[PDB]
């Protein structure tokens, strides 16, 4: 199971780790992808998870979009986890850099409540432009199921833990 995580709350845990490496080792039931509405996994967590699947995640995602159209900002879909997890929950947090509404971050985290345990990144953090301290706050105040957060950046991880209320 998950190892080396620091307990933040009754249901939220955190570790300084690359979510790709965490997924390959743990093979959780659900890994969350920091997706965009088009499921175009170019960079950030999405690009890294997709590269770990040898692009199988992108091929599956393009078929999903061809059939269903784009997701909503704040929405999600469940697809295969390929070699990383049983499932991948592709969640679209608002991209602040694209002028998307930050208030949609709570809606994005609500998707996690449909899964009893998840390996996840902080939504809307990184290249999505939101303040990761705010993302962690919304996570702890929204998600009720067991969430194991992987924070890639060591310095951000230390700031997140040391500043956690
Ligand atoms: C062998 O090629 C590799 C390429 C990329 C990664 N990981 C990576 O970029 N992870 C990431 C985590 C959080 N935010 C953004 C990115 C690992 C191996």
Curated annotation (Swiss-Prot):
It catalyses: Thiol-dependent hydrolysis of ester, thioester, amide, peptide and isopeptide bonds formed by the C-terminal Gly of ubiquitin (a 76-residue protein attached to proteins as an intracellular targeting signal). Inhibited in vitro by GRL-0617. It comes from the Viruses. Changing residue 29 to A: In strain: Mu/B.1.621. Residues 1-165 form the Macro domain. It is a multi-pass membrane protein. It is found in: Host endoplasmic reticulum membrane. Responsible for the cleavages located at the N-terminus of the replicase polyprotein. Participates together with nsp4 in the assembly of virally-induced cytoplasmic double-membrane vesicles necessary for viral replication. Antagonizes innate immune induction of type I interferon by blocking the phosphorylation, dimerization and subsequent nuclear translocation of host IRF3. Also prevents host NF-kappa-B signaling. In addition, PL-PRO possesses a deubiquitinating/deISGylating activity and processes both 'Lys-48'- and 'Lys-63'-linked polyubiquitin chains from cellular substrates. May form homohexamers. Interacts with N protein. This is Papain-like protease nsp3. It comes from Severe acute respiratory syndrome coronavirus 2 (2019-nCoV).
């Amino acid at each position: 199971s998950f190892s080396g995580y620091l307990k933040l709350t009754d249901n939220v845990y955190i570790k300084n780790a690359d979510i790709v490496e965490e997924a390959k080792k743990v093979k959780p039931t659900v890994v969350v992808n920091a997706a965009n509405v088009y499921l175009k996994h170019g960079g950030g967590v999405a690009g890294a998870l997709n590269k770990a699947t040898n692009n199988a995640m992108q091929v599956e995602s393009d078929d999903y979009i061809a059939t269903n159209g784009p997701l909503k900002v704040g929405g999600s879909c469940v697809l295969s986890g390929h070699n990383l997890a049983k499932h991948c929950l592709h969640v679209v947090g608002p991209n602040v850099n694209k002028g998307e509404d930050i208030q949609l971050l709570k809606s994005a985290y609500e998707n996690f409540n449909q899964h009893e345990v998840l390996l996840a990144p902080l939504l809307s953090a990184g290249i999505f432009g939101a303040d990761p301290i705010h993302s962690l706050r919304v996570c702890v105040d929204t998600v009720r199921t067991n969430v194991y957060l992987a924070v890639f950046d060591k310095n951000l991880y230390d700031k997140l833990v040391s500043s956690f209320l």
